[PDB]
Structures are given as C-alpha cells and as structure tokens.
Ligand binder design. Structure first.
Ligand SMILES: Nc1ncnc2c1ncn2[C@@H]1O[C@H](COP(=O)(O)OP(=O)(O)OP(=O)(O)O)[C@@H](O)[C@H]1O
Ligand SMILES: [Mn+2]
Ligand SMILES: [Mn+2]
Length: 532
C-alpha cells in the first residue's frame, strides 16, 4: 500500500493486484452493484456494461501539461500549427486534478493492473493502471499486453494511469477548462489522470498518444493502423479513421492478425502496441464478420449494446450510442501472430476511407506523392443527417488518419512513415470502404475481395486508367470483385452527376491542404492532390 501512497493514494484497505479473468467476471456480475459499474451476462457468454454518459472519447476535455519537457516538442493546440486537441495545461492545475483523483481513489477498493504498451521490450511502456471499477480493470487487461509472471515479478512502472471516473472538477471554470471532466497527461510525472468520464477508450487512446510522442522522436513510426501478415511473411498495414474498416478488414481468415489499431514500425518491422482488439458492434453480422462475432464470449467485454431481458443482444440498436463496442484479448481471434504481435517490414500500405460523398473509387494505386498528400489529408466522411432523413455528408480531415492521437506535428509522422516505406519498397493504395452513387455502402464482401487483390498482386498487375480530377489509377477489373463498382462514375445517372460531387469534394481537399503549403515540400504536393 505504501507504493500506492507514493502516488498520493491513501488508506487503501482492499487491493486487488493483477485481477484474474475469473475474478473480473465475478466482480462485474455481483448482484449488489449499482449504477454503471453493473454488468449483465449475455447469451454469448460475454459480460456487457454501460459506460455511462460518455460512450466515446471527449477530445474537448484532453489536456497536456506544458512544462520544460514538453514545451518545444509537443504539437500544441494554441501554437498556430493546425488544429488539434493537445490543449496546454499548467502544472498548478495538474496538481489540482491529481488531488481530485487521488482523493477519490483513496479509501476505496482498488484494482491495479500492470501491463505493457508495445510488443518490444526496447520501446514498450510499463504501465500501471489504477481504478475502482472492475470493468475498467477488465478493459485494460484485454487491451494492453499482459505480462508474464516473470515480468510481473520485476515490474517497474514508467507510466501511471489513474482512473477517477467518479470524481469531477468543480474549479473547471476558473481554471479555463472545457467542463468538469478531464483527460490529462503529464510527461514530467509520466501519468494520465481521468475524471468524469468512465469511458475505457480514454486509457487505450491515451497511452497510444504517449507512444505517438515518444516513438517518432526515436525514429520509429507510430501508426493508427491495423496490420496482418501472409504465410510468406508479407506484411500489410491499414490506416484509416474511426469506423473506416481497420478492424473489420484486418480480421481476415487468410492472414495472421498482428493487431487491429495501434502499431509501431522500427528497424525490424511492424509491431503491435496492444494485447487485444476493440471492435465495433453496431449492426454486427455474424455472416459478414464471423471471426469478430466468434470472439464475443466469456472474457470479452461488451459496451453500450442493448441486452434483452432474455440475455440476447440487439446488435442493431444504436439507442445508447452508434459507438457500441466489444473488447477482447487478441487470442479470441483464431489466426494471429503469436507469441509476440510483430512481423517484418510492411510492403502494402492501405489507406481506408469511408467516402460519404460517394466520389472516391473502391480502390486505386497511389503514386509516391499521392501517398504523402493523402496521408496528411486524412479524409473520411459521414452521413450526418441520417436521423433527420437527410444525407448531406460531413467531411473530416484528420492528419495521418488519426490527428486526435498525434502528439507531434503531422509532418513528423509523415517523414518517418515515408522513410520506412522507402526502405521496404512498400506500395500504397487508397480504398473507399464507404459510399458510391447508389447511396449505399460498398459491401464487405466486395471490399474483402478488393483487399485480397491488393495483397496477392492482382491489382498491381491489372490494367489501369486514370480517374479524372483526383488522378487516381483505377483497375478495369479485379478477380472476385463486382466490375461495375470499380469506376465510381458508373453508380450515378451519368459521369456528369459524379463530377458535380467530385468537384465539391476536390475543393474541400484543396482548402484543407492549404495549411501544409507553407513549406516547399508541402507546396510541391499540391500537384498530387485533386485538381479542378
Ligand atoms: N465495405 C465495408 N468495409 C469495412 N467495414 C464496413 C463496410 N461496410 C460496413 N462496414 C462497417 O463499418 C465499420 C468498420 O469499423 P471498424 O471497427 O473496422 O473501424 P476501425 O477503422 O477499426 O475504427 P477504430 O480505429 O475506431 O477502431 C464496422 O461497423 C463494419 O461492419
Ligand atoms: Mn478498430
Ligand atoms: Mn482507432
């Protein structure tokens, strides 16, 4: 307990260190629990919980302490270098938030989970997570790397994550913060503090943000991508924003899964940060996604799904949130890289996007300059009007396909990615997992056959022609793929109807890209973007 007292947490009478899966099951199903701690047992064998008022991350509540360690290296929200959520925090307000959390956890029954972030000993974080909520401990047991008993014996944390979801900050107005909630990081004390939000993804993406700070400064790419590997050792990575297909499409029975969301790329190859996968379950189809569906069993942890009185799950019900999720340890997938989630250098780099404007082609091979342009652009889009019965799509441009998690400037991630790709001779591709002129999403079946064709070389050998405006090389046909869909003009009444939309989208790309054109490298990439 005095070790806990070193963190500021007093008088803990009941300490649960390294809780087993069986204990976490017992704790969640305790009929005496109240409120959002409670779990419910589903007919699939997995416990389901509700994560409370927050059912996704709260970027507006994300703060990073600005001090002499971070001042000149962080990509700060206020430093005129493009928009981001790295809002500066004073060390004095940090101490206030730390007092809130440590007092909240003092005198409680605490779960302590030691885990690694990063598959390689030379660059991993040794993270100690502290929570008073059993399903939060379970989330981190699933999603981080579980140490061996030997690693546990000599465990030396170099980052502490203290989850005080049950406390809030009443001084937030005087302190200039956004709300009574907070997700704060301190790189001098090497700690994350959480208040107000119970959502487990803050811890997952928080540690991801810290890897995104430390690794590129050591020459190692740090990537919002999934990754898998063929029997020959050929590695693919799949970038993309939330919901664009990284987890869906890397979970592929023809490939060994490396990881689904967070990877590094060092001198030896591509390596997972995590010990689990965090899948979306909205409208989950057992036929369309059988491996992910099969992972939903005891020790998986369902979030915010609708569970019927009889224990069945209504996966289509988005009432609590569209962001229904399940975490599971990665070995709930049958065909994975083991015992360590890593492989060689990627030779296929796939940018996933869900184009709600219905303009981009299902697949295209990128030039080198197009790769850089679209990596910095980081496009996807949403049908935001759907619940009001309207389409109009809303663009998101998020640098590196994950600006919410970037702690350095986008160009620093671009430069090390390009360096790794060039050394490996990797080829890049752009895949629209989103919409076309039918006003419907491309089927998962068609997208998987597109991925197959990328990975087995058939797309590279295909005859291609250039789609106008975006100047994207697209194939005339592909094995097992519906041929009509390959040219996005074919799903509209006429190519001119596609063109009206392509022009709308091109202007959005051009306007977004302008902020990168204040270096000569950036200005020169304009020629690789869409052209009116
Ligand atoms: N053609 C398609 N390709 C891929 N996914 C599709 C397709 N059509 C529908 N989907 C659905 O879109 C979602 C893809 O989400 P997925 O979990 O792969 O996102 P992600 O990129 O892993 O995001 P995150 O980083 O937030 O975890 C799933 O709900 C999937 O069923
Ligand atoms: Mn995912
Ligand atoms: Mn993600």
């Amino acid at each position: 307990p005095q070790e806990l007292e070193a963190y500021g947490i007093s008088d803990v009478h009941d300490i649960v260190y390294n809780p087993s899966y069986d204990l976490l099951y017992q704790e969640e199903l305790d009929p005496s629990l109240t409120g959002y701690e409670r779990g419910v047992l589903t007919n699939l064998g997995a416990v389901a919980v509700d994560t409370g008022i927050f059912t996704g991350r709260s970027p507006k509540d994300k703060y990073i302490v600005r001090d002499d360690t971070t001042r000149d290296t962080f990509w700060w929200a206020d430093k005129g270098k493009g928009k981001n959520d790295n809002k500066p925090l004073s060390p004095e307000t940090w101490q206030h938030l730390k007092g809130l959390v440590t007092r909240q956890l003092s005198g409680k029954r605490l779960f302590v989970v030691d885990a690694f972030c990063g598959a390689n000993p030379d660059t991993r974080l040794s993270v100690r997570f502290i929570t008073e909520v059993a399903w939060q401990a379970h989330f981190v047991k699933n999603m981080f790397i579980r140490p061996s008993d030997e690693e546990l014996a000599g465990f030396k944390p170099d980052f502490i994550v203290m989850n005080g979801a049950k406390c809030t900050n009443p001084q937030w107005k005087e302190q200039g913060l956004n709300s009574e909630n907070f997700v704060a990081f301190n790189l001098t004390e090497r700690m994350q503090l959480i208040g107000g939000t119970w959502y487990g993804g803050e811890m997952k993406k928080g540690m991801f943000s810290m890897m995104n700070y430390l690794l590129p400064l050591k020459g190692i790419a740090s990537m919002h991508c999934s990754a898998n590997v063929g029997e020959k050792g050929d590695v693919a990575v799949f970038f993309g924003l939330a919901g664009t297909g990284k987890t869906t499409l890397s979970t592929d029975p023809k490939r060994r899964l490396i990881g689904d969301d967070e990877h590094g790329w060092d001198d030896d190859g591509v390596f997972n940060f995590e010990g689990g996968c965090y899948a979306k379950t909205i409208k989950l189809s057992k036929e369309a996604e059988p491996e992910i569906y099969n992972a939903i069993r005891r020790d998986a942890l369902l979030e915010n799904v609708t569970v019927r009185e009889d224990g069945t799950i209504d996966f289509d019900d988005g009432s609590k949130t569209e962001n229904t999720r399940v975490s599971y340890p990665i070995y709930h997938i049958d065909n994975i890289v083991k015992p360590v989630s890593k492989a060689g250098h990627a030779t296929k780099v796939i940018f996933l996007t869900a184009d709600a404007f219905g303009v981009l082609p299902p697949v295209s091979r990128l030039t080198a300059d197009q790769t850089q342009y679209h990596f910095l652009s980081g496009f996807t889009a949403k049908l935001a009007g759907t619940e009001r019965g309207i389409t109009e799509p809303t663009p998101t441009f998020s640098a590196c396909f994950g600006a919410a998690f970037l702690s350095l400037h986008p160009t620093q991630y671009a430069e090390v990615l390009v360096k790794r790709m060039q050394a490996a001779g990797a080829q890049a591709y752009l895949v629209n997992t989103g919409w076309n002129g039918t006003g419907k999403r491309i089927s998962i079946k068609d997208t998987r056959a597109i991925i197959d064709a990328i990975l087995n070389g058939s797309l590279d050998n295909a005859e291609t022609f250039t789609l106008p405006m975006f100047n994207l090389a697209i194939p005339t046909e592909l094995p097992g793929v519906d041929t009509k869909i390959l040219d996005p003009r074919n799903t509209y009444a006429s190519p001119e109807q596609w063109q009206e939309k392509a022009e709308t989208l091109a202007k959005l790309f051009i306007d977004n890209f302008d902020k990168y054109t204040d270096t000569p490298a950036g200005a020169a990439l304009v020629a690789a973007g869409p052209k009116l």
